[model samples]
Target: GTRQSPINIQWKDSVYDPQLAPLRVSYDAASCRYLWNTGHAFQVEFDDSCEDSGISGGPLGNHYRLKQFHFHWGATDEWGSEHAVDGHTYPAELHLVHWNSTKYENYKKASVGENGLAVIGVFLKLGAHHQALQKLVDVLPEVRHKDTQVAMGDFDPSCLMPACRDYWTYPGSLTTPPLAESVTWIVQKTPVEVSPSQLSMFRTLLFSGRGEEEDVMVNNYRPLQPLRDRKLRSSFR
Candidate 1:
């Protein structure tokens, strides 16, 4: 099972817009809040030091390390989610996809193929204020287009780590384009928060990279996978 673990999945995840592959889940939109919970809060950090979100292959000689990530949004305030629960869509979603090496020597080699990566996913709930996310959101006005890179300074990405490290781990794909089955997904249950204004800004994004003149890139998220005979575990539980 370890050697021939990931079955080939058509690479279909994307950031700019929904492409060839359709999202298995439905996207709900709302004004400010998309999804929320009262159970527990998890905080994970996004820093400039770490590699950008893209395809990340383990340190294998023949593969490329592609570690990519993206956000999900709504059209309004009622619903905007990637992973629906009992048919419920959250306000936002974030996936930090990476690679774990078992067959390769380094991440570079593991990134090119569907056999070299482990991805961790974290969920974000809408709220009143999220000072931590301001740094990234503030740059929205500057880079409101596709392939926009902001001059991020030294920052600790660990601020996004959830106290309840418990997660639902499984063998999955990129969830976007090249949905390679190489990913070992570790999805956290705890969700974080972002202000309404901030969320409004996120929805304002466009797949065409046009300055607010193009159709908003709303509801850009992957629907939840079929929990295929998989098991979800938690660090605290």
Candidate 2:
């Protein structure tokens, strides 16, 4: 059952689903707990100890809790995103992973079932220096190697979102290992901006564990997969 993710979305072929509700996103900046290097990308984890930060509505009928957020990037700025639009590639991508807290025991249990996960996918483009990104970038050196963790100060994950609310959504799977087919992907239309220097900091990360030869974490994105028989829905016309 390897129905994979990171598929190319054909904009013209998308059908607008009026039944879809506006995605309700809310996060408490103070909920920022810790950041870690998982060998793939640096993820900022939130305090899901309570339902302080989460997403509701949209294609999802239940409230999904935000577990953590991470990124996928290329060795160069030319191409590195997991999912693409109309065959166009972005320099990087952001994934805000959520789980159905109302119906599931935990992320692990929800991860294997249908309608268990809701992930917000945001593309990254080169433009003005992103002020919010500087906070995370400043600590990159601390977690350069895999399995390293650091305490992150109060950081609002919403600051990383694109201003546009228009999005494309579909049923997909995790791009990385375990490769569970439980994700409902909500990909934003507009991309967030990051300067060249800011993106370079991501490349400095090492996929290798400590005390091993450094393996640059550049081009960490998985290749685009097949979309299968799923219908691609849009929140806008």
Candidate 3:
């Protein structure tokens, strides 16, 4: 239980491991499903029955299937991201959830085991507009209320990642419930750019479901947890 996630990543404290290979990420556009508001966060589900979409190498000892991807953001641009770097907070963070299909039957069964999941965390900073992210930003209206879902076209999740391959890795848990301590987290080093208008659109989402008194869906992120015995292994020097 010493490996809880969302830890503050201190660059100097990280141990550079040249053994860490560049992460191999291959995602199939055909696996795209629907994007929905789960009241907590908006997630784009994927059909992971096939091995067409998954991540390998880096800290992951096995190939993990891409299950879903979501985001966490705050009301304003001051702070939002779950994981911080040297106490700095980005306005938003993106989580690409993957399950270890190599050792487990499915995500359900895998969730209960250690190393069951691998999550790629990407920080979103305010800057120029992101073309790939704009695809989802434009559809924010469709899933304004919780429990709402809309069909997503053939979208490549990889397009949302940064061009840089550097990252920090650690053993962690799911940020949301059941808060399973079964995830190997790969937090990207390079932050991605998003316009101010695009981030404002994220605050437009509502946590309340249909016909309920609408409550804004802002600050949908977990607080930093203790990193008892964990060490952040860096892919960069």
User: Local error of candidate 3 at 96, Å?
Assistant: 0.5
Question: Which ten contiguous residues of candidate 1 have the minimum total lDDT?
Answer: 23-32
How would the candidate models be sorted by TM-score, starting from the highest? 3, 2, 1
Model 3 lDDT tens row, 20-123? 87789999988888999999999999988766588998887878999999999998999999999999999999999999998998899887687788999999
Instruction: State the lDDT of candidate 2 residue by residue for 1-237, as single tens digits.
Output: 546898998967799999988888888888789999998899999887767588988999888988889999999999999988989999999999989888888888888887789999999999999999999999989999999999987898889998777899898999887888899999999999999999999999999998999788988888888777788999998
Model 3 spans > 4 angstroms off: none
Query: Candidate 1 lDDT, tens digit per residue, 43-99?
Result: 122321223333222222222223334566667766665554345556876665444
lDDT of each: 0.48, 0.90, 0.90
What TM-score would each prediction reach against the true structure?
0.64, 0.97, 0.97
* Candidate 1 error regions (>4 Å): 1-68, 101-109, 112-115, 210-213, 234-237
Candidate scoring better on TM-score of 1 and 3: 3
